[PDB]
Design a protein around this ligand. Sequence first.
Ligand code: PVH
Ligand code: PVH
Ligand code: PVH
Ligand code: PVH
Ligand code: PVH
Ligand code: PVH
Lengths: 81, 81, 81, 81, 81, 81, 229, 229, 229, 229, 229, 229
Amino acid sequence: SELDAKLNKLGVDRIAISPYKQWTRGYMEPGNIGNGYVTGLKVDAGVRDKSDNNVLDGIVSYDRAETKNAYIGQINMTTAS
Amino acid sequence: SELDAKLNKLGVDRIAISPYKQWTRGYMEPGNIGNGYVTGLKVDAGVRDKSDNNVLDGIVSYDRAETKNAYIGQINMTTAS
Amino acid sequence: SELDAKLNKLGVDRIAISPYKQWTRGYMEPGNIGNGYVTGLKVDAGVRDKSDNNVLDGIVSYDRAETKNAYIGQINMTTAS
Amino acid sequence: SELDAKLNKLGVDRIAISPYKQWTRGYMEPGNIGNGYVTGLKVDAGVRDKSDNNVLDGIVSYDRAETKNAYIGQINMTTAS
Amino acid sequence: SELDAKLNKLGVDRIAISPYKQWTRGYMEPGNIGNGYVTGLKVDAGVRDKSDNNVLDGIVSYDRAETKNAYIGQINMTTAS
Amino acid sequence: SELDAKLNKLGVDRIAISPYKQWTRGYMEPGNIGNGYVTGLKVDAGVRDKSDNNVLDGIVSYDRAETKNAYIGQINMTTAS
Amino acid sequence: XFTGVQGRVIGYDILRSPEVDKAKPLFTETQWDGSELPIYDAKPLQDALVEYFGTEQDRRHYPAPGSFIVCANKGVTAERPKNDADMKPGQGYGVWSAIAISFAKDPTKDSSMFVEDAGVWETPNEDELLEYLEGRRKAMAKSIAECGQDAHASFESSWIGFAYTMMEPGQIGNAITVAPYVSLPIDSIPGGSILTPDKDMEIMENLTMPEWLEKMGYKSLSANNALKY
Amino acid sequence: XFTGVQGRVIGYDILRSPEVDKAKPLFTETQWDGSELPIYDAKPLQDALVEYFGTEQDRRHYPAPGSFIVCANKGVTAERPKNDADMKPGQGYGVWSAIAISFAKDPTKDSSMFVEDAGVWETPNEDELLEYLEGRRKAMAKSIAECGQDAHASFESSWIGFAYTMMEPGQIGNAITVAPYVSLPIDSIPGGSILTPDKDMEIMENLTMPEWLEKMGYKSLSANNALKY
Amino acid sequence: XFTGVQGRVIGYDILRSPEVDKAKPLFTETQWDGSELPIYDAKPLQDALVEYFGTEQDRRHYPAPGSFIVCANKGVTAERPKNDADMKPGQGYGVWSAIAISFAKDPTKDSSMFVEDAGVWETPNEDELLEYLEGRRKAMAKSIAECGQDAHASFESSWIGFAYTMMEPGQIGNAITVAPYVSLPIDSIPGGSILTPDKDMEIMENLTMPEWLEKMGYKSLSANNALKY
Amino acid sequence: XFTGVQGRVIGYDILRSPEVDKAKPLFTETQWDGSELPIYDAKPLQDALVEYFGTEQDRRHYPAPGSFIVCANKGVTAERPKNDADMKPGQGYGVWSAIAISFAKDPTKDSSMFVEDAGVWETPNEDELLEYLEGRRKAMAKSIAECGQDAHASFESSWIGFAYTMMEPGQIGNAITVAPYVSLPIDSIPGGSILTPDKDMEIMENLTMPEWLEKMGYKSLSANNALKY
Amino acid sequence: XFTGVQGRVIGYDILRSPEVDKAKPLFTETQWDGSELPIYDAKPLQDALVEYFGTEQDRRHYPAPGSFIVCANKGVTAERPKNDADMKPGQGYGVWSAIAISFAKDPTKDSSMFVEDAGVWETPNEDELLEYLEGRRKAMAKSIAECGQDAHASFESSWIGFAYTMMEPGQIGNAITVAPYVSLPIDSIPGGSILTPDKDMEIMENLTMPEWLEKMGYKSLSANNALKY
Amino acid sequence: XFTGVQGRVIGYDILRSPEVDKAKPLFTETQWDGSELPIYDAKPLQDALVEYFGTEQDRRHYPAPGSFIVCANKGVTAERPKNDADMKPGQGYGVWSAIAISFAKDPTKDSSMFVEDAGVWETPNEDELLEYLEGRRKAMAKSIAECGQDAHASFESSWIGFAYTMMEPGQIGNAITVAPYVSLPIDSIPGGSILTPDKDMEIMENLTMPEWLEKMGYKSLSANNALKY
Ligand SMILES: *N[C@@H](Cc1c[nH]c[nH+]1)C(=O)OC
Ligand SMILES: *N[C@@H](Cc1c[nH]c[nH+]1)C(=O)OC
Ligand SMILES: *N[C@@H](Cc1c[nH]c[nH+]1)C(=O)OC
Ligand SMILES: *N[C@@H](Cc1c[nH]c[nH+]1)C(=O)OC
Ligand SMILES: *N[C@@H](Cc1c[nH]c[nH+]1)C(=O)OC
Ligand SMILES: *N[C@@H](Cc1c[nH]c[nH+]1)C(=O)OC
């Protein structure tokens, strides 16, 4: 849009394409086309029956949360802040 | 320098260029030129008036700290250790 | 293998080459060839004599652990989960 | 146009960009962007006072012809047929 | 084959792929993959009813020859020697 | 040199590298690095004992000429003018 | 966090859901520059992402199995024991997470910004819980403004949503807020092509979420509020 | 030659000069498939290229100094001596060149085709000369059809033009017909950008030659027939 | 976490150690789909990585100094004071970490998955400690199944190992579990070449760990159980 | 021209036609190094190319419409008038072209070499004509050796073929000899993929022409000598 | 963390500030190899980065809005209540962070290393606080040596700095130590060009911080100790 | 042709042979702009190329076997029969070729230009022949100026050389003039690297031909006029 037109003059582009069929890909992953990124908002929560293994309890809750609603299944999640 | 000359024979290069105008870019970000990186030392601290919302109190203190002195403004900060 | 043959039709490839001599490189690092990754299993532990500086105590224990057995020496470790 | 849309599915694209400022470039020359070509129609003729050196007489006539009208000045002309 | 293995050490590779569907492409054409070439042997001849226009008589005979047998139809033919 | 510095601002560069070991390569050949070219001056002549086959007589004379002095041996020679 | 010059937001910049040009501000916050910053419930944007990725059941354009998706995220985990009056320290009856996206007036200087939060809930009164959240916005809107101030950034809108859950006795809860940064696949873009990178985006910039689903042959999963987070 | 799947023609596909949608056929030729192939004087297309590249004086988007432009070309050179009745063999009073571009009905199977020609002229009567050319078209149109036949190609239009010159006594003439194959520079494309490759073409596909000159601030050099070849 | 479509595992998919086709399951877990999921001690895979990277002393194909290796990891740190009966809260006599890799039956839909864990130990009885771990597998095998269920993923095998250590009085211990994601260097691949990317992998896919060491001239460091983690 | 380090020949190096390992030398020529150079009729290789590209009718993997195929080539054109005893200078009853490919013993130093020729025929006795050609080989074999000598190149085999035609009275003939240099498309390679460049060649290196046709579902057009050039 | 083969440090390797070749060691630490490791206050390097990125007010070559800058970092947050004698557990009057960079003698084997730390302060006596820090170096220098020992790394210098702040009653403090890893923009490099990648670095390798500012037309913000962290 | 913005000349721009800064003009030609254009014998440049490529015997950095070198070239072939007084038309006792390189004063507008020529010689008096050539320069210098005029190009120098040969009775001669356009290999550049593209040229720009040979360990083949063309 009229915006990109101002960025392209600064050397910025917002093209973000995934060479994969059907699947979306993480920004920075190799083989992606374009130097931009698309982002979204996902908030959700999940529960698991308390065993003694805290970590595992969290891993699973987290897993059930990722899987809930907007599916971001078997993803290696990096963290930025 | 005389150093790069030894690296280039190992397959290493330290060129790190940002295709953007005026702005620096994160290592690994696409569109960067060269397979190296430039690093620096920033230590600073900031404060915010204690509300009840701890997270938010931290987010802001962190924000005021990033903004202090060596400016690393609106940056998505990844963590390595 | 017979597998890649099915992925290549989806747009996926698992080639992961490091242009460096002898050294392995992190997935996503620039200059790597191919859009895949090789992974492994490292579990180890290390100890350091308790000083007062907790962080430093940890940094070192961590360092001695990385260095133990399967060597992943002077590495900037990113975290995914 | 509606056409390219059918070619792109065959693996053909007709983008032909010259990284140079103001100047057009020969198809196949390195650094060009896109895998297509733009072509045109130039017909012209030029004369030179007959010396004994035939070749030279032709070189110049040819030169004066290239320079006439649609200017294709100091060009290394390859030939296809 | 065992041969390429000796070339790859000299910096030579003989991969020559055409990104097009079904069609072969000229060596040096952009978008081709690999730095090699595949060549073949085509000898043929064609005739046309003598008009006064020599050039045209040749253009057509040439055209009928290209089209004969091993088809190299609507090709822009460059010449090397 | 001070010159390139003016070209680089026009989008022109004169880097011309051959990924091959020891051998020079033709401008436009794939796998070459840089968007420039290096050129030289070769003038020579060769002779062959007149058989009936004119073409072949020429092919050989030409061959002996290419091979004479500045060696441009087994080269596919394109022509520009 | 942020989403600046190199980004667009699903549902907003691309695949826009009309809910945006039909939503009304819950209130406003005074930005340092002296202008107001309307606040909206981020429900539209949240639902939008759901349409695109799909769900575990009706899967769509989700991330490749084993891919590395960088996310601006945060979370929280707490324990709700078996009735037990002694509810230790970091325990509760429910858990929640919140997320906010603020778009800059001028994307060419200022990056749009994300502000997330999460926490544990103390009263089994879910009904109550909501009230807390309904107030939290004001809390966030404040920090947001402060950050803006910190970098002299100025936003025009700001959307915020949440997610919560009551853990059953003996159940651990995990509340997450997360903004993923991806690249889009070809087949998810109508009439696109691997050879028309910039054009492919323009298509998305133009297609409204509704149109997209139709042109793709996807039933709207967000339907009429069919989704609770 | 040819100009197929990978190409467009200045003045026609891009930077189209209205002269096309205002020109009338000089005659028709029966293609093997049984349909007619109208023939037009290629004047528009020739003038068009001139606008783009510019001239030695009013230079524009010409090829980079020392570049390698591949061209589908041919030429001819002859001598016109000092009156001399003995006019040897390959001598004459003038020289000419001709070029034709035939667009295929279906560019996805058949490539559009170039057909050039050139020759020497024998009578100092220039006026006459033209008549010859005016007929030559028919000659070319025939070969064209034959080639079409050779590959089962079918065209819709076909444009042909020429260039000639009378050599003064003792002057060598060189007539050339040439189709160059280039890539376009950024600044010649209005509102384009090195980062929007495919979009940059679409712009050209749409801009008519007139508009282009205006949007670029270029005076029309082709003016009203201001150019003779 | 995961290791899907874009990945292979050292020792398993590439540089396979025969220990795999000679190992027996410690037990099985019922997957949602109703099939069993055998569990093996991940010892082979662990030793394998060691052969490849090398050690601080016998260094081999370790990561470049200062490289950025992304790792699916976790860890734990605890204090063991000087005898002191008052052992504060997060203190203990030893610390441990565990890791599990589960391969999907169909890698084209489901990604293979990592599941790690770590913790502090309370009784100075190391001998005891092991028993705990020997049970932990069952614990992990359960979560694993649950996750599988969460995404309808189905695995065929699953390998798990650990690492532990008893801290001396006054020694802080750090137990780590970590899966690194790398690219392989040329010289580590026999008869490979920078110009034969896909072929280079095929070589690794075929070479068994034993052969590799021999063809490379490397002595087996894993030898006969020479390695304790 | 030549075909060196960067090349392979259809029918020989790739898509090999068994005709090669069943052909016998027509004679030998003494190379400067003192070894013999067997000569074969290039019929197999010629037919091979035909199978790959296809014909105007049964089209296969021919060059893209409007592509630029560089070719090591040469040709000849002559006129055969209407009976006319006065047969001017460059006129004749038929025209011919010839081509030769000589492979170097050591492709890593010496490039393999092409040697082409063409000419006009003088006696309407076609039967005679062949005799001329049948001798021409010896003529070429000589030049070939000379060139080899010129660069200290040494070949092992050398294949030569021709093409001729008798022009009807008033018919212009055009005899062409041409070696094209191309890249192969994906679909022409069985089980290949745009992502496995080097592997794709290995496939071709291995597949014999026969197998190829079968695996591709192509009927052999070369059949049993079905082709005359 | 580390900064090895692929890196350079602002102020040191590039844009060197003379403060380096004028600084004196605060003390030394015995490295495993038996040599000393001088320690300097990292003030120069800290100021240097400031000159390059600029500040919120005098902005310069800071990171693009919304970019993803990976940083080797750590931090700390604590509460200083309203006078309140009951100062809970993780509370204090001030907070601090520290950072150290150790360059290896031989960058071709050993990577240069970062070592950071942070903490909360307990006595409102700021003056006191400094003394703590002034000692902390020795603490770090020790760990540093240990790590070196861990990988048989040997350094030549080592620079360490800090940052602190006293929180007002009721103010939360956040102390951060952070090493960013970036790529440099073109305009920040004098006489550079997007087409001269390797040369562009050489320029920076040579330009001293002073020169840079002048050649760029930048006033020195670090001035004479104008900066307090 | 030409050699413009994208080029450099062996012996002149790179690997410069001192012979240049020691040569004196044979004469001058008046350029359209009114300045003189000194003319030199191109001997230095010719010898230079020889040093680089090597000869059939002492081979050096010649083109890869089977490569495609584009060359601005021309040639000539003639027959010298067995004494025979009837010397047909295109026959003679010797044959020659000539080449000229003119550098523009301002390479940023004007491209440097090549001008070649060739021909057959008529008198067996070789000694005479030279005189012809010695005059030909003046002939070329004229055309050169004309072309310059044609494009408003202005040169500063201009170097011209030749090559000739007397054919024995019954020997066909082939005189060639040729300018090749190449890319340089790594090993021919001292202290260069595949990773330092632009730097690699700068090295060549600086190294004089003499130094080069020494630094490379090459004996000067051009020696003292050791080469006759
Ligand atoms: N955008 C981050 C928080 C942030 C804002 N300023 C610095 N950090 C986010 O909201 O959480 C991931
Ligand atoms: N397009 C070429 C001629 C041609 C047509 N078919 C084969 N060759 C042209 O017209 O001249 C360069
Ligand atoms: N694979 C991660 C954990 C995981 C599984 N599902 C979501 N997260 C791991 O085991 O730790 C790094
Ligand atoms: N290979 C060329 C001829 C050749 C051999 N040596 C120099 N030139 C061919 O045979 O004709 C195109
Ligand atoms: N460089 C890291 C710490 C480190 C050193 N060895 C392993 N880890 C840093 O100082 O903190 C980000
Ligand atoms: N440079 C070419 C001739 C030339 C000059 N102007 C147009 N053409 C050369 O000298 O021959 C290859």
